Amino acid sequence: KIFQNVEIKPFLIDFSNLFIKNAAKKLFQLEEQLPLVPVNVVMDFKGISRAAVHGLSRVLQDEIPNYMLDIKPGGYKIEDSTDLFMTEQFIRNRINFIPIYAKNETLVFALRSLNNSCEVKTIYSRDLIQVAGPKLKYPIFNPTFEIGFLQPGKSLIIEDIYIKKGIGRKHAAFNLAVKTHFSHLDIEQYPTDKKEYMALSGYKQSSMTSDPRHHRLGLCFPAVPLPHINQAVRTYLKNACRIIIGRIQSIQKIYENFEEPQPELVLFSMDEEKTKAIITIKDETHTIGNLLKTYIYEMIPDISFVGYQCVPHKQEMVLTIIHKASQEDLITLLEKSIQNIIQTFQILEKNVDELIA
Amino acid sequence: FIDRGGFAGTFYREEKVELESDIESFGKPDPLITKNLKPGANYEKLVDGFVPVGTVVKKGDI
Amino acid sequence: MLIPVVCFTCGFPIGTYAAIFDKARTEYIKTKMGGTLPQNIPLDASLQIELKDLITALGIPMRVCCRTHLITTLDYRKYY
Amino acid sequence: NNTTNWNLCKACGFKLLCPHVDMLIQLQAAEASYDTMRTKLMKFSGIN
Ligand SMILES: [Zn+2]
Ligand SMILES: [Zn+2]
Known part of the structure; x- marks a missing residue:
């Protein structure tokens, strides 16, 4: 159960204020809520890497x-x-x-x-x-x-x-979606009101060392109908999942064709039995590259190198993977990592369907 | 911020062309009579000597 | 020339509560104006005009950018 | 081969001489000024 404890709250006009009440009633003859209102959705994720949560946020x-x-x-x-x-x-x-x-x-x-x-x-x-x-x-x-x-x-x-x-x-x-909240729930925080800690972020672990896996992400949608909010927000979430999966599946069609000469995949056999794989994909963002790096790193703890360099003026993502295995074993590990990404976002789909009634 | 209109606006230029009294005139030239037309030009956008308001004129257009 | 439809920074739909925020604000100023000429309002040196509760009642969140652009945007109709 | 296509060589079969080259040579040998040469070679003008 990766995604649990979601709460949804619309942004409504307070008609208890006399100024707003009079202004709305004399401008638009408005006495009740607008047909479309912004909706703030706060989501709790557990047992999932921050790369996946941030990629979901970026896609949304x-x-x-x-x-x-x-x-x-x-x-x-x-x-x-x-x-x-x-x-x-x-x-x-x-x-x-x-x-x-x-x-x-x-x-x-x-x-x-x-x-x-x-x-x-x-x-x-x-x-x-x-x-x-x-x-x-x-x-x-x-x-x-x-x-x-x-x-x-x-x-x-x-x-x-x-x-x-x-x-x-x-x-x-x-x-x-417009960002409204993002935090890690498995990292303690300093009280930043004190003048001793106001120059720091607040977390008690440095980002160079921390690996949080319990996050809270809150996003606001600008226009959702009043009587179908739970129907709309859920859809949005589900949509995002498919998009990511789709993009990942594109890379899954590259590794499957490593035997034939493919422009977007380059394989070298280095010294000391080391192999190198370069995956250059055009019009990709830090989402897919970060997900790939994180899941390859999780799959291969003792990997020699992995990087997802997305270049602004080249409009492309270049993923470099250096590992001490053969080409076939490296491709097998890459396919396993891609399958892990796919199953993670499928579980996200299932949890989204299960939570929002 | 750029796409939403931040520091966005419209920039204006003017073209003020004058005539020689009874020698020159405003009108679309024809290839078979007029001489030394500008290479790589576009005379088809003229309407009664002037390009109509609202059309997009690019480099090389008369 | 008007209050933007969405916040320039994040894109929250500021415009859909823009017009109301304009008109209502005026009466609030009329409540706090006080024996002073209109064009001398930004020089009164005794005013305490706060629009926090008005924007809150509009449903707009407590975002710095959104309230900044809602409050500070000039209106072309009011100068021309 | 007045216009619109190359002159062809009867001896071999490939292209021989474009007509505007013939007209240009005639004008150059015929004391033609640049303006009188630029305007006459206007029926050979390229893409309109
Ligand atoms: Zn904003
Ligand atoms: Zn020949």
């Missing part, structure tokens, strides 16, 4: 597929948008970063704002009319966003607002 942050709202080329109608201040760049930057919880990539919206008044009129996100796709039985974004504002006698017409899929690493608009 900016390596999981996610949906945003984007404007197709030519959507911003210059013929009708007479406003001089709401430029295409500003408005599309506003639209891209609205957190959405979409069901399909078919929905297409439109924003048609006309200002017949003598005062600046604020364009909110409730003015996004769905023009294509099946009719929504539940909103996919909050209606309280401020898309823009129009000067008197101006207009803003935007068509072909569609749902675009991508990973958060390439563009920040696909980021999913």
Whole structure:
């Protein structure tokens, strides 16, 4: 039971405050909770390396597929948008970063704002009319966003607002989870309020020596429907697992083809019966490399060398493994480590399904 | 922070071209009459002598 | 030109509680303003305007970046 | 072989001389200035 003791708490508006109550009620006629609210999820992991937990966190942050709202080329109608201040760049930057919880990539919206008044009129996100796709039985974004504002006698017409899929690493608009907590529960901590310890991190063991295996990770999701929170968060967690497994399985297709000359795997036979394996994979991050290094190191305690160098200006991860075995034995150990990673994340899948009811 | 609009904005440049009275004119040239057209240019984006507002002009475009 | 939709640092959905945070704040200032011209508010030398509880009631967490960007962001509508 | 393709050698069969080279040689032997040579070799202009 690797993953236990998860707790989920939404972020809700306190209507006991008179100022917030009056402002919301006179702006949006809002008297109860919004359709989509942020959710903070705190998770406890036991008997698992911090490499795996941090990789799961990274994937949930900016390596999981996610949906945003984007404007197709030519959507911003210059013929009708007479406003001089709401430029295409500003408005599309506003639209891209609205957190959405979409069901399909078919929905297409439109924003048609006309200002017949003598005062600046604020364009909110409730003015996004769905023009294509099946009719929504539940909103996919909050209606309280401020898309823009129009000067008197101006207009803003935007068509072909569609749902675009991508990973958060390439563009920040696909980021999913925001970090709220990360700690190790199996390492003692100093009281850092004292002036003797305020210059230190707090943990009683140095990171150069410690190997924690009992962690607490808390992440916040920006947009989750109220009546299905446990259905959404669970899905997110499960999604992350598959992604990692998928990426790991890619490396599992490299080691299987070590007999044929493969560009992403290079094998040398060094002196003193030593063998060397270099795995160069493009567009990989520290997640996969760190997981590979940690699990190879666990599998081979007396390994000669292992490193996962991810280079920023080369956009690639190079894993170097030097070990005193033959090529076949090294490949067998690598496959065993990959299988260990796969089974660990399968157990994470099972625990996620078991915990969140 | 960059993608979200941190220190992000729009940068402007202007092109002010003048004419010689009754000698020159604004209009799209034609290959079979006009002389010494610029090598590797792109004259097809002109509309009545000026590129229309809203199109993306890159290097080599007239 | 407005309060950002998401926090520039982490990306928390600040914008969905932005507009309300604006308007409500005004009345709070009107409660604490006191015999003083509006444009002289940042020079009163006797004000104690705290917006901690307002942002807390909005549901926004106690993150430094999120509250910083919510409070400090200028609005183009209010200067033009 | 006026335009659009190479001149071919009847003696062997491979390419012999591009037409613009013939026109350039004629102009060079015909006291042609650079401008009068640049404009005349415009029907041989490359990719538009
Ligand atoms: Zn923030
Ligand atoms: Zn020949």
